[PDB]
A paper describes a structure:
In this work, we show that unencumbered views of the changed, non-ground state can be obtained by recasting the problem as a multi-data set, 3D background-correction problem, which allows the relevant signal to be extracted from conventional single-data set density. Our new method—Pan-Dataset Density Analysis (PanDDA)—comprises: the characterization of a set of related crystallographic data sets of the same crystal form; the identification of (binding) events; and the subtraction of ground state density to reveal clear density for events.
An accurate estimate of the background can be obtained by averaging near-convergence density, in real space and after local alignment, from dozens (>30) of independently measured but approximately identical ground-state crystals. In contrast, PanDDA directly eliminates the thousands of strong electron density blobs with no statistical significance, objectively identifying only regions that are unique to each data set; the ground-state data sets are provided by the many hit-free crystals. Using an averaged ground-state map for subtraction, as opposed to a single ground-state map, reduces experimental noise in the ground-state estimate and thereby also in the event map. Furthermore, averaging over multiple data sets minimizes the influence of stochastic variation between the data sets (characterized and discussed in Supplementary Methods). Finally, the averaging generates an estimate of the ground state that can be used directly as density, bypassing the need for any subjective modelling and map interpretation. All crystallographic data used for the PanDDA analysis must also be made available so that the analysis may be reproduced. The group deposition feature recently added by the PDB22 makes it realistic to deposit all the many changed- and ground-state structures, as well as event maps (see Data Availability).
Author numbering: 22 to 142
Write the structure that this text describes.
């Protein structure tokens, strides 16, 4: 149907906007602390601590399959990256501090992304 095509173009345009948002958020992680999944070979107990691991490569895979239906879903995954790190790692660690900085700087980006998603539709 033509309706299904139009909805698919909307998903595509949302995907385009989320790709730009993702690139901007990942720039706020110049250390690349959040680039890849935590390795279970190197942190064997991780899944005892963290039930829903997340990282920017996993988000990029979901995005490229057009797996985010709305900005809320995308935000949920970004907040898992931050929140998981702030639970597993202590306040005095380079990891935790990296997450706080990503959260604060990412907030700016996400605030305008929300306006753009409402604005364009």
């Amino acid at each position: 149907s033509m309706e299904q095509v139009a909805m698919e173009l909307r998903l595509t345009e949302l995907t385009r906007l989320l790709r730009s948002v993702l690139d901007q958020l990942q720039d706020k992680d110049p250390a690349r602390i959040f680039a890849q999944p935590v390795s279970l070979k190197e942190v064997p107990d991780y899944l005892d601590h963290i039930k829903h691991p997340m990282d920017f490569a996993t988000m990029r895979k979901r995005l490229e399959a057009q797996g985010y239906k709305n900005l809320h879903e995308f935000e949920e995954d970004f907040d898992l990256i931050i929140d998981n790190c702030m639970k597993y790692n202590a306040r005095d660690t380079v990891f935790y501090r990296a997450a706080v900085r990503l959260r604060d700087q990412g907030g700016v980006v996400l605030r305008q992304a929300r306006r753009e998603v409402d604005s364009i539709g």
